[PDB]
């Protein structure tokens, strides 16, 4: 879910807007970017040059996908949207702030940073 | 447009051999319920009407 | 009979702690027919009639403990299989039939611009020019649905009697409910 050139907005403020999905990060084969996962895409467009800027080589992760995530709790969760957050090699966000909620996940795959910044984590 | 067609006179022999596996097998028919005669195993007829009920003619 | 086996109950998951899906399996003790030994000479299967009532309508642990229940009179309740264990079951494929090299065998078909052209399903090729006619290699529309399927790492979770029946860890019994299931925990790795 979310590869080639599927797009997804920001919720942090890094200075973005939306981003194209190059590669699913992990190792060869692999074909999917599911929240918690980390993506190798770029700017489809970003504010008036906050700090990022349109068409900027990038690194972001998974937190919002209407693909529906099956919670080990035989439960089910999804969103009206599909987007995520940028990052500093060091699985570290940039956006100083968050936006739409997210999912335990993150925690499970490292990121607290946002985990709490988040307005609400579902 | 004959891409593929035989290539060597089929050989009567074989040929027929082919046509070999074929064959018939007489109707398994039985004998009348009381109609007395031979019918199509399971049915009344231009001899019957019966079975158990007179559902026919003659 | 060296083993233990019965038929497919069905599947459903539910509960646990995180939650988990399994499958139900029917089988008390389907009696005990002789037992495996090649002693003094060739020995394998005898038959001192003691069966059902219809059956003549057609008329060393594993096997060992057997001796236990196969001499008892015949039958032999199933379930050493206990709390958290790995037998293995061999279902019977599934009358799926003769299909196109499509699902029968993973393969990419008629692409786009021709991925439709009232075109479609149908393998790509056979053998080159010089090589030589054909290989027994490339499968074919190799029918399916009938295979003597099965698998491994078959973990059983729990069981109870009310009717001797078993709960399973992930179903995929192969064949369908009311189907022929045989289990074992063969050369287990999770041991």
């Amino acid at each position: 879910m979310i590869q080639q050139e599927s797009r997804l907005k920001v919720a942090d403020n890094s200075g973005a807007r939306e981003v194209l999905v190059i590669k699913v990060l992990g190792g060869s084969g692999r074909r999917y970017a599911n929240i918690g996962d980390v993506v190798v895409a770029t700017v489809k467009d970003a504010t008036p040059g906050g700090v990022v800027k349109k068409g900027q080589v990038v690194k972001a992760v998974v937190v919002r996908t209407k693909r529906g995530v099956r919670r080990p709790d035989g439960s089910y969760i999804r969103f009206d949207e599909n987007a995520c957050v940028i990052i500093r090699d060091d699985k570290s966000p940039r956006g100083t702030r968050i936006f739409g909620p997210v999912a335990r996940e993150l925690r499970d795959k490292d990121f607290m940073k946002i985990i709490s910044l988040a307005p609400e984590v579902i | 447009a004959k891409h593929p067609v035989p290539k060597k006179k089929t050989s009567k022999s074989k040929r027929d051999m082919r046509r070999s596996h074929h064959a018939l097998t007489a109707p398994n028919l039985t004998e009348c319920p009381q109609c007395h005669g031979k019918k199509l195993s399971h049915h009344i007829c231009p001899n019957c009407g019966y079975y158990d009920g007179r559902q026919v003619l003659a | 009979v060296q083993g233990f086996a019965g038929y497919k109950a069905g599947m459903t998951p539910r509960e646990g702690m995180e939650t988990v899906p399994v499958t139900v399996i029917e089988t008390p003790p389907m009696r005990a027919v002789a037992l495996r030994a090649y002693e003094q000479r060739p020995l394998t299967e005898v038959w001192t009639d003691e069966f059902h009532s219809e059956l003549d309508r057609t008329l060393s642990d594993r096997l060992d403990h057997a001796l236990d229940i196969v001499e008892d009179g015949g039958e032999h309740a199933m379930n050493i299989f206990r709390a958290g264990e790995y037998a293995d079951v061999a279902g019977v494929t599934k009358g799926k039939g003769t299909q196109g090299p499509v699902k029968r065998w993973g393969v990419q078909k008629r692409k786009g611009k021709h991925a439709r052209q009232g075109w479609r399903r149908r393998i790509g090729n056979l053998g080159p020019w010089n090589p030589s006619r054909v290989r027994s290699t490339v499968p074919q529309q190799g029918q399916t649905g009938y295979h003597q399927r099965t698998e491994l790492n078959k973990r059983l979770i729990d069981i109870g009697e009310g009717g001797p029946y078993t709960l399973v860890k992930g179903s995929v019994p192969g064949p369908d409910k009311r189907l022929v299931p045989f289990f074992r925990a063969v050369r287990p790795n999770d041991q």
């Binding site: - | 019918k39 199509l40 399971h42 049915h43 009344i44 007829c45 019957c48 559902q55 | -």
Partner: protein, 105 residues
């Protein structure tokens, strides 16, 4: 589809009229259940029931005819109000083992 029905239709129709026709194996095997089913409705017997049965058959005369007429002659049993009987012969050129079916009586 629209044809499966149609059939059942006219066949269901014609039949009730006579109560045992001549169509091939299957054809009959089905016109049964259905037609059959229908019956079970003439049995229910009422505003509704009728509003259905007809719904398909389309035709006072009958529709009523059965609901009242036959229906009764059946009010008692348990489905089966039909006895699908295979036949001895077969339509020509073809060679189809037709067959006959009636309202078990």
């Amino acid at each position: 589809s629209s044809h499966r029905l149609a059939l059942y239709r006219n066949q269901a129709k014609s039949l009730l009229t006579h109560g045992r026709i001549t169509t091939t194996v299957p054809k009959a095997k089905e016109l049964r259940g259905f037609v059959d089913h229908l019956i079970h409705l003439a049995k229910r017997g009422d505003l509704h029931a009728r509003r259905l049965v007809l719904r398909d058959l389309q035709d006072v005369k009958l529709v009523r005819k059965l609901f009242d007429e036959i229906a009764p002659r059946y009010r008692d049993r348990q489905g089966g109000y039909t006895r699908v009987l295979k036949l001895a012969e077969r339509r020509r050129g073809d060679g189809a083992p037709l067959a006959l079916v009636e309202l078990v009586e």
